[PDB]
């Protein structure tokens, strides 16, 4: 299923999120060849209650560069084009929690991951509901390990805040939807940049990401 | 069936044409944005030098890619039979010359394919068409559409103006008919406004035609 990831692929991302009773559409393209994502996300509903950094990780691991020596270690591509389910529970230290279910599939000459998010237990005038996070991101390593039992995968994000840091504990689970592949323990190193179209009246985020794999 | 036309769509076009016993094959590739009514296409005459100029073949060569504005969504025949598609038949009377008769099938294979035979009869040698006296250009037109309760589809009638190198104009009467292939949708009378530009890749040695097209709908106030 890596065949599908030779060259450029169109991307659809739709998130249905509910944070403390407060109820994003993204388009662009991804190059598994370069681990390069270019995406613009659109809130639609109104002024988002959470900052733009919290939602990103919740915003396509299959587009990551697994080097040629690491080919047989690509869970994400192997369930193609039938796809995966990605569930995460995300504990923000000293704050609330996201609980996320995602489906990552081809529904095209074009990919899609359609996602529900339910955020509960966030404190008002906390760092999250108060939008005290900077419009930026740090680099991270993605420690991946196999799950013979669930036939899939499992896997602390630093959000820059007034100079403090909010950590966000990520517990992730990935299950194939067809009958696909598992690889040994490995790590994904990331970079993401936030930007904005100053022509855009609505609340938005332009995203550029670079992710390559390493570890054995 | 509009789901399929959100964003960019790949296009395949194949023509099998016979004009006064002259057999030729044209293959076209590119993409279309129903969002912008935007077609970009390169056509290739696999067989040789085309017998007929390249401007006669453009209409015969995807009206589902026309932008119908938001008030006009329920007036989109072409979108509604997709992915199973339509048949597009035309008889084209070139005033003071010969006639094309064209049958086409427009479907998804998610690339949008229309496979077409053309048969031209009674064109006069050293007429404007067989003599290649047409300029390599196009005009803007209105595409007048009307429903067909009986044939469960569409008709359309229009006189395409082809510029002649001698300053004259060749008119070409288009009688068109569209029928669904599945069990799809119909709209009231409305009109499609068009623009097309011809260009060439100066690197390909075969003769060919690069196309950019802009088509939007209007008519219901």
């Amino acid at each position: 299923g890596e065949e599908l990831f030779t060259g450029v692929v169109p991307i659809l991302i739709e998130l249905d999120g509910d944070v403390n009773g407060h109820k994003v559409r993204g388009e662009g393209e991804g190059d598994a060849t370069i681990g390069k994502l270019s995406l613009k996300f659109i809130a639609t509903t109104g002024k988002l209650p959470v900052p733009w950094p919290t939602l990103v990780t919740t915003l396509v691991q299959a587009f990551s560069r697994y080097p040629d020596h690491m080919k047989r270690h690509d869970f994400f591509k192997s369930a193609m084009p039938e796809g995966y389910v990605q569930e995460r529970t995300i504990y923000f230290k000293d704050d609330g929690t996201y609980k996320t279910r995602a489906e990552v599939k081809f529904e095209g000459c074009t990919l899609v991951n359609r996602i529900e998010l339910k955020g509960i237990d966030f404190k008002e005038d906390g760092n999250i509901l108060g939008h005290k996070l900077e419009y930026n991101f740090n680099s991270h390593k993605v420690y991946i390990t196999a799950d013979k039992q669930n036939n899939g995968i499992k896997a602390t994000i630093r959000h820059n805040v007034d100079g403090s840091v909010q950590l966000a504990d990520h517990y992730q689970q990935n299950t194939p939807i067809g009958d696909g592949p598992l690889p040994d323990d490995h790590y994904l190193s990331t970079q993401t940049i936030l930007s904005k179209d100053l022509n855009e009246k609505r609340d938005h985020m332009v995203l550029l990401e670079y992710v390559t794999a390493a570890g054995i």
Side-chain angles (χ1 to χ4, degrees), chain A residues 1-71 73-83 85-104 106-200 202-216:
Chain A
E2 291 179 349
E3 297 177 352
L4 297 167
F5 291 99
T6 63
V8 185
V9 176
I11 295 171
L12 293 175
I13 298 168
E14 293 174 350
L15 275 66
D16 306 356
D18 290 347
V19 177
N20 291 160
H22 299 292
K23 297 189 180 179
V24 171
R25 284 183 179 171
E27 293 178 351
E29 292 174 347
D31 291 349
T33 60
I34 312 168
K36 184 185 193 301
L37 294 178
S38 62
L39 295 172
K40 293 180 180 179
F41 292 94
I42 290 200
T44 61
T45 54
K47 290 183 176 182
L48 285 186
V50 296
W52 288 106
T54 60
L55 297 176
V56 158
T57 55
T58 75
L59 275 166
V60 230
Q61 255 138 214
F63 291 98
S64 58
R65 278 186 147 160
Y66 293 95
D68 295 346
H69 299 274
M70 294 299 295
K71 291 179 179 178
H73 300 289
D74 311 1
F75 289 102
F76 301 97
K77 298 178 180 179
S78 66
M80 297 333 275
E82 292 180 348
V85 172
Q86 291 185 164
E87 293 175 350
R88 294 179 184 171
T89 62
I90 301 169
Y91 295 91
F92 290 77
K93 295 182 184 175
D94 296 342
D95 274 338
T97 68
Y98 297 139
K99 293 177 179 178
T100 82
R101 291 185 184 176
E103 290 181 352
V104 179
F106 282 96
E107 299 192 345
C109 299
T110 175
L111 215 187
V112 176
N113 63 34
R114 282 178 184 172
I115 308 173
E116 291 177 0
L117 312 177
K118 292 182 177 181
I120 306 171
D121 301 339
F122 295 90
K123 292 183 177 181
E124 291 177 349
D125 285 343
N127 285 333
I128 286 171
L129 295 175
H131 300 109
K132 293 179 179 179
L133 284 173
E134 293 180 351
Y135 296 76
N136 285 332
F137 296 100
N138 294 335
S139 61
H140 304 111
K141 290 183 179 180
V142 177
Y143 300 103
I144 290 168
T145 67
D147 281 345
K148 298 178 180 179
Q149 296 176 336
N150 287 335
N151 294 334
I153 324 168
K154 285 169 183 178
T156 69
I157 277 171
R158 299 185 179 177
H159 297 291
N160 289 336
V161 188
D162 71 351
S164 62
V165 172
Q166 182 65 80
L167 298 171
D169 293 347
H170 294 279
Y171 294 92
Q172 316 181 353
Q173 291 178 157
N174 295 161
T175 67
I177 301 168
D179 289 343
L182 307 178
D184 305 342
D185 296 345
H186 302 299
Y187 307 158
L188 294 174
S189 60
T190 78
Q191 275 178 323
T192 74
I193 278 175
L194 291 176
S195 59
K196 293 175 181 175
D197 293 348
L198 294 181
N199 285 338
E200 183 65 13
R202 290 193 297 274
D203 286 347
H204 60 285
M205 278 310 204
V206 176
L207 275 170
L208 295 177
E209 183 178 2
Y210 294 67
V211 178
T212 67
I216 189 66

